[PDB]
Ligand binder design. Structure first.
Ligand SMILES: Nc1ccc2nccnc2c1
Ligand SMILES: Nc1ccc2nccnc2c1
Lengths: 216, 206
């Protein structure tokens, strides 16, 4: 039984949560996901969540006042506050396993430019805070990163049921003149294991040499 | 002018991205089950050579891509076994006329689909990261967003901390250098902040 709160200025964008793995998890009552519009915690008539950065630079920074009020209401001392950001620690499969046993995740989604640093500083006096990057590409905002984190974590939650995977095949055994590798049809568990290992080796060394401790 | 076609068994998943309005991209989402052959609308089957999970059927994907792709298409297949998707990749793809993104489950699509497609068109199998998702839909979302923000009209080292009003909040002041009006010094301070944060969070970048 896990609770996930997502805070965003684009709550309708978190709707893809409702299908696939996360939707089934919610429907089965293993997790509850609640999405909050950040502007709920604004008090000016224009619902302003951002302002220009001190020191200059392009873009805007999300205001600490609004985030502070939001997180005051949503978070407790047991909360794990997740802040997706291009400047975060890497989010890995190990991170996913670690967070899969948490009672309460709060995910704060900002734009790329980011949230005033003092929000995370202030929250860390009260709760555990993790700023993480899902990758070294650039998104407009944290919302898509939130969906990725949620999907990676939820599939590891109890109750929701190295080397690259090599190629996989299914019926029919010949298709457009391309045959499935005969060893896979042979029913020889040993030779199949050997073949799959060799395929995975070739693929990892070609596509992800870093996984085996090589350059690039 | 970019066209993106996405093929998925969860078409609802992708509808929220389609809302940017400028009309410079077209993003179309297609339900893979449109191309199934049987009344049960089967999209996957047991893997040859045994093992857990299911593999998506070549006959179904073959029909879908035949209808949707042309020789000009860049066929993107998100997969944990892919080449890394990077910002360099996003820049490259941002000038393409036609991307087709084939979303499959973790276990993947029969390899003959991509192998066959690669005899007629460019195919790119890519991973958005080394965590495991159940399906490629979230990865497609990440890819679409990273690419489209580089298409004009939609509008190293880590970035260090940023600050805005008010100057003092809950007992913490904005670093005074940022208010100094010494812009060379501010740049140096930010560069040192970046160095420190990169060392701490992403030493791989050095
Ligand atoms: N909040 C954000 C904004 C953009 C991002 N781009 C890549 C990875 N994480 C991100 C988080
Ligand atoms: N098609 C898929 C399925 C799962 C994934 N997990 C991580 C990265 N890419 C993925 C693509």
């Amino acid at each position: 039984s896990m609770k996930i709160d997502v805070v965003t200025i684009f709550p309708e964008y978190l709707q893809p949560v409702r299908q696939s793995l996360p939707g089934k998890a919610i429907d089965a009552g293993l997790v509850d996901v609640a999405v909050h519009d950040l502007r709920r915690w604004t008090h000016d008539v224009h619902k302003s969540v951002d302002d220009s950065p001190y020191g200059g630079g392009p873009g805007m920074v999300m205001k600490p006042t609004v985030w502070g009020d939001a997180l005051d209401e949503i978070c407790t001392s047991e909360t794990l506050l997740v802040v997706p950001t291009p400047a975060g620690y890497p989010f890995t499969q190990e991170t996913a396993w670690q967070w899969s046993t948490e009672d309460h995740l709060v995910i704060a989604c900002g734009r790329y430019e980011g949230i005033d640093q003092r929000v995370a500083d202030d929250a860390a006096t009260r709760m555990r805070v993790r700023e993480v990057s899902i990758g070294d590409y650039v998104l407009n905002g944290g919302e898509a990163a939130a969906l990725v984190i949620i999907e990676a974590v939820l599939r590891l939650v109890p109750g929701v049921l190295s080397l690259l995977e090599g190629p996989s095949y299914t019926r029919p055994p010949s298709w457009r003149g391309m045959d499935v590798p005969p060893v896979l049809l042979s029913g020889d568990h040993a030779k199949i294991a050997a073949w799959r290992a060799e395929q995975s080796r070739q693929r990892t060394i070609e596509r992800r040499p870093d996984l085996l401790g090589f350059d690039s």
